[PDB]
Chain A
Amino acid sequence: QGVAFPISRDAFQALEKLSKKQLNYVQLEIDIKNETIILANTENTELRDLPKRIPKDSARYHFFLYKHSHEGDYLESVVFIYSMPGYTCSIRERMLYSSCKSPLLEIVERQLQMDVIRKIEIDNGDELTADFLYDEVHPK
């Protein structure tokens, strides 16, 4: 169950900006040996560029601002993404990303009042098509 790794000041500041909608994408990684969550990428990301942000060889955490219409409303929905490409990740890498997930999500809610509307887990970036994001957030 839940293991809490410290978050870098940088990673925390980028998540603080994403909660204030100043950034639309924050990718985080676990520094496995130092047991820390660090900042990996904060590029401006629209839904069409999102598939091309997901590494192919290593697991990652992503916070993405999903802007879309749903029954007449326009929603800016912060979504959480746990990408795990497969056996390229060691058992230790796979275990740390799974165990560190909940505490990171609790700290982000408790401190930054980020409203994570959905938590998604994917094998690879090519899955993050517009329809897929819509079916995860609004499964009907």
Chain B
Amino acid sequence: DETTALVCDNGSGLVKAGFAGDDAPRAVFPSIVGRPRDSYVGDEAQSKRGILTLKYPIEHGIITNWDDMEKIWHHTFYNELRVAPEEHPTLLTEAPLNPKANREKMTQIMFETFNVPAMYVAIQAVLSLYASGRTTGIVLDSGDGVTHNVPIYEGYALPHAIMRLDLAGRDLTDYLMKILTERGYSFVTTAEREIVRDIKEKLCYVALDFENEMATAASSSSLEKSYELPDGQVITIGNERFRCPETLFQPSFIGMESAGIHETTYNSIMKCDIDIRKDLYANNVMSGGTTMYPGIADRMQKEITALAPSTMKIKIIAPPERKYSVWIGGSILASLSTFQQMWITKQEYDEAGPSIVHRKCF
């Protein structure tokens, strides 16, 4: 079909874009725009960094630079998906706490710059929650630049209670790069950081008890894993495996004022009506690439249980597809024939304006 609905999950680190009906995004590239010191997006912008000023148009999940964001969307439609956006309805995702004026701006750019026939805006956390198989719960979304605790009640996020931790995979890669660089193995360039990111995604894990795991690593090599570098050399990492994602629970490891993701979860729940706290405690849904660590659901489980009231059932839901649960959720939505009457059409926008997105999408 030349008019297949599109799904674009705009993340602060990566853009996951594809077609409605598919199981995974067809395009996954960096949210980076490079302008001369006319513009470059993604991998090529990073490559030509010697003659460009690189920028992240999505600061902590929020789109802050729209001239740059238009470059990402242009690259998404023509270079990644290889489609004409004037013939495809486009489902877009938004961050928790995304300003209403920002949501309006996104709609206007889709309709006036790209001339899309129809569009939809959904909150990332709510799509992950829905695809998990529930409508009330608290979501821990940890991606590339930001981590959020989002309490959602019947499909509506509670803005007052949403917690934002400006620490995610980007920082953990940097931290592993520094902790590897200081024990011999020196990684410096953007490509060497990509090797580190790969070590981190393949070998890192969350310890159930950090100080106990530090002790196990100090007295034996039971927790050591090896990694073959591109040149053929074999490196062996020990406590770096869990010290790196431990930063999520102890952000003081990288000089941060914000308490760990278990405490910000507790704080987020404590900001909501006592009557719904039990429903939040029993439905902690994980989503995002930085929630892929083995052992993280077990660790969040014991940490929430140590803070929560003893008469709360604490449940952590960590779907195996959570690295792409936002994109997959939108893909299922936009692929429905009954979804045809949910889209904001170009005609409805021309009559009402961009404030239609608050009514038709929410």
Q: Which residues of A line the B interface, CB within 8 A?
A: 1-6, 35, 59, 82, 84, 86-87, 89, 91-99, 101-102, 119, 121, 123, 139
Q: How far is the CA of A71 from the CA of B99 in the complex (A)?
A: 44
A-B contact sample (7 more), CB < 8 A, given A2-B155, A35-B338: A1-B155, A4-B338, A91-B332, A95-B329, A97-B133, A121-B283, A123-B315
> Which residues in A have their C-beta under 8 angstroms from that of B129?
98
Interface code B239-263, partner A: CB below 8 Å = 1, 0 otherwise? 0000000000000000000000000
10 nearest A-B pairs in the assembled complex, by CB-CB distance: A94-B133, A98-B130, A84-B133, A139-B275, A95-B332, A95-B131, A35-B338, A98-B135, A121-B134, A92-B332
**A99/B333 in contact, CB under 8 A:** yes
For this complex, 5 residue pairs linking A to B, each with C-beta atoms less than 8 Å apart, are A3-B342, A4-B338, A86-B133, A95-B131, A121-B279
Contact of A121 among B135, B325, B332, B338 (CB under 8 A): B135
- A120 to chain B: closest CB distance in Å? 9
Residue of A nearest to B321 (CB): A91
Residue of B nearest to A96 (CB): B332
Q: How far is the CA of A101 from the CA of B154 in the complex (A)?
A: 9
**A99/B130 in contact, CB under 8 A:** yes
Q: How far is the CA of A84 from the CA of B130 in the complex (A)?
A: 11
**B275/A1 in contact, CB under 8 A:** no
**B126/A3 in contact, CB under 8 A:** no
> Which residues in A have their C-beta under 8 angstroms from that of B307?
none
Q: How far is the CA of A122 from the CA of B132 in the complex (A)?
A: 13
A-B contact count (CB 8 A): 74
**B328/A91 in contact, CB under 8 A:** yes
| Total chain B interface residues with beta-carbon distance under 8 A | 33
Interface code B100-144, partner A: CB below 8 Å = 1, 0 otherwise? 000000000000000000000010001001111111100000000
Among B132, B133, B321, B337, which residue has the most Cβ atoms of chain A within 10 A? Answer: B133
Q: How far is the CA of A99 from the CA of B362 in the complex (A)?
A: 12
Contact of A1 among B126, B136, B278, B336 (CB under 8 A): B126
**B133/A1 in contact, CB under 8 A:** no
- Check if B361 is an interface residue, CB within 8 A of chain A: yes
**A35/B155 in contact, CB under 8 A:** no
Contact of B337 among A35, A59, A82, A123 (CB under 8 A): A35
**A98/B338 in contact, CB under 8 A:** no
Interface code B265-296, partner A: CB below 8 Å = 1, 0 otherwise? 00000000011001100010000000000000
Q: How far is the CA of A95 from the CA of B280 in the complex (A)?
A: 19
**A119/B338 in contact, CB under 8 A:** no
Q: How far is the CA of A2 from the CA of B283 in the complex (A)?
A: 20
Contact of B338 among A5, A59, A92, A93 (CB under 8 A): A5
> Which residues in A have their C-beta under 8 angstroms from that of B315?
123
> Which residues in B have their C-beta under 8 angstroms from that of A59?
133
Contact of B122 among A1, A4, A96 (CB under 8 A): A1
- B82 to chain A: closest CB distance in Å? 26
- A124 to chain B: closest CB distance in Å? 12
Among A1, A92, A139, which residue has the most Cβ atoms of chain B within 10 A? Answer: A1
Given contacts A89-B133, A101-B135, contact A95 B338 (CB under 8 A): no
Q: How far is the CA of A6 from the CA of B341 in the complex (A)?
A: 13
Q: How far is the CA of A94 from the CA of B122 in the complex (A)?
A: 17
> Which residues in A have their C-beta under 8 angstroms from that of B341?
4
> Which residues in A have their C-beta under 8 angstroms from that of B342?
1-3
> Which residues in A have their C-beta under 8 angstroms from that of B338?
3-6, 35
Contact of B155 among A89, A91, A102, A123 (CB under 8 A): A102
> Which residues in B have their C-beta under 8 angstroms from that of A6?
338
Q: How far is the CA of A102 from the CA of B130 in the complex (A)?
A: 12
> Which residues in A have their C-beta under 8 angstroms from that of B361?
1
